[PDB]
Design a protein around this ligand. Structure first.
Ligand code: HC4
Length: 122
């Protein structure tokens, strides 16, 4: 499955951990409050985070403070509220990692109270 696919949430809904770890792009699942439900191997290759240990943490408060901004967290909460989350933009990640330019795609999941954040290098 390709980053930015129109029905990416359908494909990923069918995947287990190993399959999510096989994706070409970083994939995080958050609940509506921003707590991390899932975090794949490709994401940890970009950020230096251990996917096994960031589970349960809050993405915006603790893990990724640079994303606590109208440009990222603001768009997340707008989409959670509207129920339409599906948005793409560029960003730079730089907390406890080398500053890294990325493309981000956020999209609501099919499962309850879950939201995908997809990331690739640019
Ligand atoms: C800015 O501080 C971003 C940090 C970051 C983004 C994404 C991650 O999965 C981990 C840290």
């Amino acid at each position: 499955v390709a980053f930015g696919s129109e029905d990416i949430e359908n494909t990923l809904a069918k995947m287990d951990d190993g399959q999510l770890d096989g994706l070409a792009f970083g994939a995080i699942q958050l609940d509506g409050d921003g707590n991390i439900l899932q975090y794949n191997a490709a994401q940890g290759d970009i950020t230096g985070r251990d996917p096994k240990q960031v589970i349960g943490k809050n993405f915006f408060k603790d893990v990724a403070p640079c994303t606590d901004s109208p440009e990222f967290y603001g768009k997340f909460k707008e989409g959670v509220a509207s129920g339409n989350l599906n948005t793409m933009f560029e960003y730079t990640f730089d907390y406890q990692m080398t500053p890294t330019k990325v493309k981000v795609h956020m999209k609501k999941a099919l499962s309850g109270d879950s939201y995908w954040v997809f990331v690739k290098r640019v």
